[PDB]
Write an enzyme that holds these catalytic residues in place. Structure first.
Site, short mmCIF file in Angstrom:
data_model
loop_
_atom_site.label_atom_id
_atom_site.label_comp_id
_atom_site.label_asym_id
_atom_site.label_seq_id
_atom_site.Cartn_x
_atom_site.Cartn_y
_atom_site.Cartn_z
N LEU A 72 -6.93 3.70 -7.04
CA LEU A 72 -6.16 4.86 -7.43
C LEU A 72 -4.70 4.47 -7.70
O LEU A 72 -4.16 3.56 -7.09
CB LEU A 72 -6.24 5.94 -6.37
CG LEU A 72 -7.58 6.73 -6.39
CD1 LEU A 72 -8.59 6.08 -5.48
CD2 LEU A 72 -7.39 8.17 -5.97
N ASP A 116 -5.78 6.25 11.79
CA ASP A 116 -4.43 5.93 11.32
C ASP A 116 -4.08 6.61 9.99
O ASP A 116 -3.61 5.98 9.03
CB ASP A 116 -4.28 4.42 11.22
CG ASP A 116 -2.84 3.98 11.07
OD1 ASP A 116 -1.91 4.74 11.46
OD2 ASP A 116 -2.58 2.89 10.57
N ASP A 134 -8.85 3.57 3.62
CA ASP A 134 -8.83 2.64 4.76
C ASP A 134 -9.52 3.28 5.95
O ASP A 134 -9.09 3.17 7.08
CB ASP A 134 -7.41 2.16 5.10
CG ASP A 134 -7.01 0.92 4.32
OD1 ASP A 134 -7.51 0.71 3.19
OD2 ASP A 134 -6.17 0.10 4.75
C1 LIG Z 1 -6.76 -0.76 -0.72
C2 LIG Z 1 -7.33 0.51 -1.34
C3 LIG Z 1 -7.58 1.61 -0.29
C4 LIG Z 1 -6.50 1.08 -2.47
C5 LIG Z 1 -7.05 1.61 -3.57
N1 LIG Z 1 -6.27 2.13 -4.45
C6 LIG Z 1 -4.98 1.88 -4.02
N2 LIG Z 1 -3.75 2.36 -4.74
C7 LIG Z 1 -2.50 2.17 -4.33
O1 LIG Z 1 -2.24 1.67 -3.25
C8 LIG Z 1 -1.40 2.72 -5.22
C9 LIG Z 1 -0.64 1.70 -5.99
C10 LIG Z 1 0.46 1.07 -5.43
C11 LIG Z 1 1.12 0.10 -6.18
C12 LIG Z 1 0.66 -0.20 -7.43
N3 LIG Z 1 -0.40 0.44 -7.95
C13 LIG Z 1 -1.05 1.37 -7.26
S1 LIG Z 1 -4.82 1.15 -2.44
#
Ligand SMILES: CC(C)c1cnc(NC(=O)Cc2cccnc2)s1
Length: 275
Positions: A72, A116, A134
Site C-alpha cells: 500500500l 502493537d 504487521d
Molecule cells: C511491510 C508491509 C506491511 C507494508 C505494505 N505496504 C506498506 N506501505 C508503506 O509502508 C507505505 C510507504 C512508505 C514509504 C514508501 N512507500 C510506501 S508497508
C-alpha cells in the site's frame, strides 16, 4: 531475494527492514519485510480480510526470514502528518475507525491479537480503504498506544489491548495530537492516569494486584472527555470512552463497537492522497 528486485526502502522496524519490491515473475509490486515462528506466520497467511494487509508469502532461507506483503502506498502516520493543518474530515475518520473495527472483529474472532497497533501500521489506499498491517507478528519502540494492562505487567492480556490502541489512534485523528505521548513506561502510565484518573479497585477490580502496580502511584483525578477530544460529538466521545475503559473486561469489543450509534451514518469517503 532472487525473485524480487528492490525498488526502495520503505522503513525500519522493531524486528527488520521493509522494502518496496517488484516480483520479476508476476510483475507484482509488493512490500518485503526482512527479519516456532514458522508455524505462527503460516497461520497468518490464512488470516485474510479486506482490512488486513495480505501476507502473500513466507520465505525462510539462510537463517533470514522474508515476509511478502501486499503493498500500500501510504500509512496513517504520514497521512495524519500531511492532513494536520486541516484535520482529517470526520466522515473519513469515522470510515477508517469502522473499517479497522471490522478488521479487528475478524482477527479477534480467530483469537489473533495485533498487540502493537499504531498509525505507522495502518495502511491506506486511494479507494478509501484502511488496513491493519504487521498483524500477529508479535530505534525506540513507541509506547503511546500501549494498553495499561501491558504497562502494569499483565502476562496474559486479551484482545482488549487492540481496542485500547485503536481508541488512542481515534483520539489522535480527531485532535491531531497524540493522546498519551509517553517517552518512558512510567511516563506513559502516568500520562494515562493524569487524563483518565489513577485507576483503583472501583473502576478496575484486581488492578492493585497487577505485577507492576505500586501503591505509591500518585492519585490523579479523571478529566472530562469533553476536554480530551474536543470537538468530537457525544456519540464519538461515548464510543471512545468505552474503548478506553481501564478494566479490559469492561472495555468494548470490536464487534460491539461496530453497533455503536456513532456508526449510524458511516460512509466511505475517498481521501485526498498525493503520492
Ligand atoms: C511491510 C508491509 C506491511 C507494508 C505494505 N505496504 C506498506 N506501505 C508503506 O509502508 C507505505 C510507504 C512508505 C514509504 C514508501 N512507500 C510506501 S508497508
Amino acid at each position: 531475494m532472487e525473485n524480487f528486485q528492490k525498488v526502495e526502502k520503505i522503513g525500519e522496524g522493531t524486528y527488520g527492514v521493509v522494502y518496496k519490491a517488484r516480483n520479476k515473475l508476476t510483475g507484482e509490486v509488493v512490500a518485503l519485510k526482512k527479519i516456532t515462528a514458522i508455524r505462527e506466520i503460516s497461520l497468518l497467511k490464512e488470516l485474510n480480510h479486506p482490512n488486513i494487509v495480505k501476507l502473500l508469502d513466507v520465505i525462510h532461507t539462510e537463517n533470514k526470514l522474508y515476509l511478502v506483503f501486499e503493498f500500500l502506498h501510504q500509512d496513517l502516520k504520514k497521512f495524519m502528518d500531511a492532513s494536520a493543518l486541516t484535520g482529517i474530515p470526520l466522515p473519513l475518520i469515522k470510515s477508517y475507525l469502522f473499517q479497522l473495527l471490522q478488521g479487528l472483529a475478524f482477527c479477534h474472532s480467530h483469537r489473533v491479537l495485533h498487540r502493537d497497533l499504531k498509525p505507522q501500521n495502518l495502511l491506506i489506499n486511494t479507494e478509501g480503504a484502511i488496513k491493519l498491517a504487521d498483524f500477529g507478528l508479535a530505534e525506540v519502540v513507541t509506547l503511546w498506544y500501549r494498553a495499561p494492562e501491558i504497562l502494569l505487567g499483565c502476562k496474559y492480556y486479551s484482545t482488549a489491548v487492540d481496542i485500547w490502541s485503536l481508541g488512542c489512534i481515534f483520539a489522535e485523528m480527531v485532535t491531531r495530537r497524540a493522546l498519551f505521548p509517553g517517552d518512558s513506561e512510567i511516563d506513559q502510565l502516568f500520562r494515562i492516569f493524569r487524563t483518565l484518573g489513577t485507576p483503583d479497585e472501583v473502576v478496575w477490580p484486581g488492578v492493585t494486584s497487577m505485577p507492576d502496580y505500586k501503591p505509591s502511584f500518585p492519585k490523579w483525578a479523571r478529566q472530562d472527555f469533553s476536554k480530551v477530544v474536543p470537538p468530537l460529538d457525544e456519540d464519538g466521545r461515548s464510543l471512545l470512552s468505552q474503548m478506553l475503559h481501564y478494566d479490559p473486561n469492561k472495555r468494548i469489543s470490536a464487534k460491539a463497537a461496530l453497533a455503536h450509534p456513532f456508526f449510524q451514518d458511516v460512509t466511505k469517503p475517498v481521501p485526498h492522497l498525493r503520492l
